[PDB]
């Protein structure tokens, strides 16, 4: 029983570490898309403002 408890704790620790690594990778892959979308939004907004100004 004692050996089983020790093994359970070690396995949970390893699983949590792997989960943290996967979460960090997902975070960076999402930040790339966030930057792309931010650039696209800024471009669209400035284009709309300039077009509205030129319309007059």
């Amino acid at each position: 029983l004692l050996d089983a408890k020790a093994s359970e704790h070690a396995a949970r620790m390893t699983a949590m570490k792997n989960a943290t690594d996967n979460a960090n990778e997902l975070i960076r892959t999402l930040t790339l898309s966030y930057n792309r979308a931010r650039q696209a939004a800024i471009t669209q907004e400035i284009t709309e403002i300039v077009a509205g100004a030129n319309a007059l």
Partner: protein
């Protein structure tokens, strides 16, 4: 003239696009997403003309069901937000719910009716008052119960009840059913009489219940359709028990 009218607009997004094109061709200054300003005024003027006239005006009524089509399930877009800010509610449909076997894929969490309660009969109100709480609890628990392994007794009971309710709420295309039979079926669901029925057997249970009511218990349907209220609880309970006894559980 004192009559009741129902109006359905197939797509207000097409109207918005056409109005934007016309305004741009007339060389009016564009605004957000090239949509001209007063794009909200257009839809407000259109939709605000539907009303329930008072008794002095003849008592007529016009109800409208505008449609708005979204891109990739984005409900926070310009036209969807403008239309949502005008109407008295919204019925939201989702692709994930559509393909998960749930038709007509009503999203209960994101749907709301600002006239609810007053727009229901007494029986339907007193039967379906708790259904929103039931679905809220089911969704909240199911959001994590597939891995949480909490397995508390109350959580298990709530999950089973919510799954049975979700199975009940499904429907087939071009298959309308009377309001009295709806009242009876949600009554049976909420009272817990079908809590032992398997989920896969729930739909066949509902079909057999409608067939059984078509033969016996017809006076309950007549009473509901004549008085807009539930019949005596004991008679309805014993009829439900009789149908449950004669039902073959698979």
């Amino acid at each position: 003239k004192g009559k009741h009218v129902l109006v359905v607009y197939d797509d207000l997004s097409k109207q918005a696009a056409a109005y934007r094109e016309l305004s741009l061709l007339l060389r009016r200054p564009p605004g957000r997403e090239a949509y001209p300003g007063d794009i909200f005024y257009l839809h407000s003027r259109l939709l605000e003309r539907a009303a329930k006239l008072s008794d002095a005006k003849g008592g007529g009524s016009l109800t409208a069901l505008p449609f708005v089509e979204t891109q990739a399930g984005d409900i926070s877009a310009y036209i969807p937000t403008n239309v949502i800010s005008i109407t008295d509610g919204q019925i939201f449909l989702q692709s994930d719910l559509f393909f998960s076997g749930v038709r007509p894929a009503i999203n209960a969490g994101l749907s709301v009716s600002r006239v609810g309660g007053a727009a229901q009969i007494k029986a339907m109100k007193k039967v379906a008052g708790t259904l929103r709480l039931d679905l809220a609890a089911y969704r909240e628990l199911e959001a994590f119960a597939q891995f949480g392994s909490d397995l508390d007794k109350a959580t298990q009971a709530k999950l089973a009840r919510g799954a049975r309710t979700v199975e009940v709420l499904k429907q087939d295309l071009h298959q309308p059913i009377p309001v009295e039979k709806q009242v009876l079926i949600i009554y049976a669901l909420t009272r817990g009489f079908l809590d032992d029925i398997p989920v896969e057997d729930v739909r066949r249970f509902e079909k057999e219940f409608y067939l059984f009511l078509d033969q016996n218990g017809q006076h309950l349907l007549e009473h509901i359709r004549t008085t807009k209220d539930l019949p005596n609880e004991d008679d309805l309970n014993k009829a439900i028990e009789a149908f449950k006894k004669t039902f073959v559980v698979s």
